[PDB]
Amino acid sequence: PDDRSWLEHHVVHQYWTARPSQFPHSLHLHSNLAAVWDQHLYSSDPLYVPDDRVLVTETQVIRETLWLLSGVKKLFIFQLIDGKVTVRNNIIVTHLTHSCLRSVLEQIAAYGQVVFRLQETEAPFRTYQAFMWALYKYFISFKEELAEIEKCIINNDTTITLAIVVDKLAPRLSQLKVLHKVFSTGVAEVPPDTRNVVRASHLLNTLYKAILEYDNVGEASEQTVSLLFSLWVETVRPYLQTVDEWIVHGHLWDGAREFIIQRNKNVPVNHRDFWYATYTLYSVRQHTMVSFLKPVLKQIIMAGKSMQLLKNLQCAESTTCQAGARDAERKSLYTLFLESVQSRLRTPKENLMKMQSIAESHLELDDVHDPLLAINFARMYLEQSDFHEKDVCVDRSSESVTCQTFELTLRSCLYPHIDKQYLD
């Protein structure tokens, strides 16, 4: 334990352990502000009983703050009680007053609580899966910066203060606040008993309204506008895929019944109501109209009905199943939309030869290479070794003045291609 204790003294103190790590600090008034404040309090009120306060390092506080912001649960200073991140009451820093440190940590804890609520997302449905994917991408982007901050802290070469870290995270903190509000409105405000279709429609409408708000907010929301655009693109990807499948195959494949149109299985194509009853909009509540598709929703419905008819009419093998552009080779509505958006925004045997060379370098001249064995060994060793087989930048910040309105951008990049396919 002695060698281990020496390391433990030199590898960073057990202060994170409930064992009180006493650390040497400068007694200068500017450096001993906590101790001087304790002395003043002790001097001023004869009723003041000194509470047990834990002395934490500023670097240690920063590291724990980054870990909280990294989404770590069960922090020592910030405790999670009923899903609320709460600061332990007995924590003090040398350079801060207990009340001031508590206030700053309370702001940080509020943001952490927001993250924690956002961190708990399971993704049970296609739309929720897309929202989770976008959230994961956002959290990845945040974790990158967090890791860079942690690396700079680890290097310990430069004085990093809590203020410096807060300022560095300020743009990210603003983006996080906007995301928290948008997420709360889009998901948290959705009643739990709402139908998956209804939940999806409410989320989609919330996304559209948020998009309008951030587009009207101008340049200052550029990072937020980009985030929202990525969220919208991701959320439409499954919806656009379902629309594409209905248009191309004439079959509405909707396992969760999240699309605004439901097919009545009871209406066969030869049924008189096939044209009218086979595909029903989930119209029971007028709220089921998809706002982003709403300008084109009627054309979409007509196209889907027509494609369902053609695929549902026993068409003779129509040559217009051209072997040319496969629907799999057709750019998906998500893919076509992303490509059109980027283009308008200007936005973003050989193995056998290798095995033969390896054999010549390592096999004796006289041993005939067995081509079945040569291929097998290539795949198992050389192709195993050489397996170094290791995005729509919808950021309006570049040409925000030239970027179309979210609705205008949608109409110009997505709706024209959909209308073309519908017409065809």
Binding site: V11, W16, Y128, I140, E144, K390
Partner: protein, 191 residues
């Protein structure tokens, strides 16, 4: 420890990260030298490692044994996972873990380059596989639990192909392509 952690993720359980046939890879105990938040991060990484270990165990269970030439191949499908499609499934799983192995090797190289790196860098770098592996593990567990047999497993994979994770979608497409290659081989023989 980082090398030890990767070894646990590489299938070498140690004293800190114990592999349990029932519990999988787990942090053995609270150690006095780590902050409880570091313990939580370690437990999340051990969750990912446990899933990887379970995947490797499944791969060995259904692919790791030489095929007994029992005269009746049809009965192998009942008790044990068997069939050419089962071999293709195991091969696909190993191929999907190949990129994970490559990423682990890159992590190893980085840790060799910088001894001061912390677990947060790994958690950042490995998060993509922390999202990929749970979904494929769920799909495999569903296949095992439902005793999906022959090409009917392919239908389940298609059902699983409808997942929301783009990387999981691509991986399941690769696996489905391998299984369809085998199916096409059988179909070619028949036709």
């Amino acid at each position: 420890m980082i090398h030890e952690l990767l070894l646990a993720l590489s299938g070498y359980p140690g004293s800190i990260f114990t592999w349990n046939k029932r519990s999988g890879l787990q942090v053995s105990q609270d150690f006095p030298f780590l902050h409880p938040s570091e313990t939580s991060v370690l437990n999340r990484l051990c969750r990912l490692g446990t899933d990887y270990i379970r995947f490797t165990e499944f791969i060995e269970q259904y692919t790791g044994h030489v095929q007994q030439q029992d005269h009746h191949p049809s009965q192998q499908g009942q008790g044990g996972l068997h069939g050419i499609y089962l071999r293709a499934f195991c091969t696909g799983l190993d191929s999907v873990l190949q990129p994970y192995r490559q990423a682990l090797l890159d992590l190893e190289q980085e840790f060799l380059g910088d001894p001061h790196l912390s677990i947060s860098h790994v958690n950042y770098f490995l998060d993509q596989f922390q999202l990929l592996f749970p979904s494929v593990m769920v799909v495999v567990e569903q296949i095992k639990s439902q005793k999906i047999h022959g090409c009917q497993i392919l239908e389940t994979v298609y059902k699983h192909s409808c997942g929301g994770l783009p990387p999981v979608r691509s991986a399941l497409e690769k696996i489905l392509a391998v299984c369809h290659g085998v199916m096409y081989k059988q179909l070619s023989a028949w036709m």
